[PDB]
Design a binder for this molecule. Sequence first.
Ligand SMILES: Cc1nc2ccccc2c(-c2ccc3c4c(ccnc24)CCO3)c1[C@H](OC(C)(C)C)C(=O)O
Ligand SMILES: Cc1nc2ccccc2c(-c2ccc3c4c(ccnc24)CCO3)c1[C@H](OC(C)(C)C)C(=O)O
Lengths: 46, 50, 138, 136
Amino acid sequence: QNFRVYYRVWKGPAKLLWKGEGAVVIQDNSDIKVVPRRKAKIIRDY
Amino acid sequence: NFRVYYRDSRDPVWKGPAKLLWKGEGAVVIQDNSDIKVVPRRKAKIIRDY
Amino acid sequence: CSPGIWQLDCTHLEGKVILVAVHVASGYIEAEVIPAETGQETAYFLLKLAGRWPVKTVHTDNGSNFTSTTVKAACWWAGIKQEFIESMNKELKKIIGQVRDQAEHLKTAVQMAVFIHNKKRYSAGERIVDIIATDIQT
Amino acid sequence: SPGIWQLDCTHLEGKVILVAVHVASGYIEAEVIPAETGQETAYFLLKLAGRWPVKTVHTDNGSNFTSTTVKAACWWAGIKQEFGMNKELKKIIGQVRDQAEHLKTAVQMAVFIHNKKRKGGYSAGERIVDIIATDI
Ligand SMILES: Cc1nc2ccccc2c(-c2ccc3c4c(ccnc24)CCO3)c1[C@H](OC(C)(C)C)C(=O)O
Ligand SMILES: Cc1nc2ccccc2c(-c2ccc3c4c(ccnc24)CCO3)c1[C@H](OC(C)(C)C)C(=O)O
């Protein structure tokens, strides 16, 4: 289960770290950040 | 070769493939099974087979 | 062998119309979500299908959309005969249900499910190309 | 070559035709879409990928192709996107255009004509299935 978040006009893919109640902590390049849950969709792979 | 689909009333439904006999400015004469029929050009869809 | 035999069906889901083509021999699926269950839409579908696969025969029900003159026209043009098991259709519904929440739009879920179905293993996606290929090559 | 495709937008009659070429075989898929958006492009790509083993897609810097919706589709399915028979298609559409009311109908007619045509010496429709089949 490899998950990809596209975040906040959209940005991604960024690598899933932790998803919590109202936000998800994520990073791609080096910049770790936290975005509120609902506008940072998480779609897996096949 | 050429197939004509036509409306031969107000418009219940386009009527099935009919043979093109003659196509003129304002009308087309077609044969549907045994029946020669005349419809306006504007009530006639004429499609050439692939 | 039946390389040219397909089946056409309409499912309703979330007050929308999914149109499904099954290549009977391989179990392969194409699907499109359409705005209306019309003969125009059905026929335009059939054209797309026929330009992509060697389609000899299409199995359908007495659906007004399938008995429509637009569909008949498409068939005559492309040289498809129209005739008047459905586990690949019911399986598709299942998979859509499974993946439904993964995507916003139903259409996205449908195409996801088609992809899942064709690729699962061997696979229907492989079987169809194999079948069609062996029919051209022999 | 098996799995390499190219994606392009033509504009015609103030409409957007989206075209996929399987580079190896010359085979075509096309769809007329309401807007030149990334959403539409991506939904196209999903349909394409569910039907063919598509590994790599070549596109331009089109805002629709550089759109994340498209990126998302690619990552989800298997597809690498590169940024570094189309002209024939336009020709055929022109030829058949008057035979049908709607441009979309003309486009699909033209696709059919193109894929089924031979050089008598196989058709593109045949070449692609052959290629994919021999692969696996
Ligand atoms: C609008 C229409 N309206 C119609 C009304 C009655 C009968 C056919 C149509 C046809 C028609 C149907 C099937 C075909 C056609 C072809 C050329 C031209 N028209 C059609 C070749 C492939 O198969 C069509 C075509 O449109 C649909 C495909 C959306 C139905 C068209 O654009 O002419
Ligand atoms: C609305 C959206 N909005 C988006 C905004 C940003 C990024 C992607 C999307 C995506 C998206 C893109 C690619 C995918 C998706 C999958 C599941 C869910 N959404 C998507 C699996 C297949 O590949 C989507 C999806 O819709 C489109 C297909 C019209 C883009 C969706 O329905 O969620």
